[PDB]
Ligand binder design. Structure first.
Ligand SMILES: O=C(O)Cc1ccccc1
Length: 235
């Protein structure tokens, strides 16, 4: 059984909680960066260690490595997301990916070109997300955000708040194709099917998309348990 390796923001280096729910029969291992805040200043303090964490996961027998942070991978633009991926691959000899690549792949899989943004972030990070998506030939539309920079604070946001955030972002641009719910620090699994039910458009969420994309890269065609959104169930 291929192990999937994940580089995660918190120092503790825990497998993000969504994995046990989405893919209960797949093994995940993780290595933690110790990110201090979800801000460019925070990213700058850990970004250089990503390659070393990739190498650790390789030594542990990982079959694929994903950098499981959207903003760490998009904050410098599309070229850096690609270059960082290549650096990880050259360091490990393994298939490597990032949570930003994951959400691009998920949005494309669901036919989303015009995308409403529902995010956890402050606006410098939101602007960088919009610029990244535009570089990648997507069209960011409405935007609502929570303005959070703490890693732990993001895990505390409840399902109903996240459903409402998505609905408000979509209602700001109701001819959008879908919604990006951005930040792998959010616990979004119960929010996704509710938003999709109510609005009739797909949602791509950072953490779940990261898992979907890593499992994709592992090349076994493993399928998630049902009810976590069209991204998973449309296979
Ligand atoms: O995805 C992000 O942009 C940030 C993030 C990822 C995982 C845990 C906390 C924050």
């Amino acid at each position: 059984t291929p192990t999937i390796g994940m580089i995660v923001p918190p120092a503790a280096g825990l497998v993000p909680a969504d994995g046990a729910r989405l893919y209960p029969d797949l093994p995940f291992i993780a290595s933690g960066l110790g990110l201090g805040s979800v801000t460019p200043e925070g990213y700058d303090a850990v970004i250089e260690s990503v390659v070393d964490h990739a190498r650790r996961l390789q030594k542990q027998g990982a079959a694929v490595v994903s950098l499981m942070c959207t903003s760490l991978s998009f904050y410098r633009g599309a070229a850096f997301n690609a270059a960082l991926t290549v650096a990880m691959r050259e360091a490990t000899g393994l298939p490597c990916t990032t949570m930003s690549t994951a959400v691009l792949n998920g949005l494309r899989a669901l036919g989303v070109r015009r995308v409403a943004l529902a995010t956890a972030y402050i606006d410098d990070v939101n602007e960088r997300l919009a610029a990244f998506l535009a570089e990648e030939s997507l069209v960011p539309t409405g935007c609502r955000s929570l303005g959070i920079t703490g890693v732990e604070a993001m895990a505390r946001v409840d399902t109903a708040t996240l459903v409402d955030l998505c609905v408000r972002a979509f209602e700001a641009a109701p001819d959008s194709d879908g919604i990006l719910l951005s930040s792998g620090g959010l616990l979004t699994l119960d929010a996704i099917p509710e938003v999709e039910r109510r609005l009739g458009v797909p949602v791509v969420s950072s953490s779940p998309a990261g898992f979907w994309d890593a499992v994709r890269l592992a090349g076994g065609g493993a399928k998630a348990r049902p009810g976590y959104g069209r991204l998973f169930d449309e296979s």
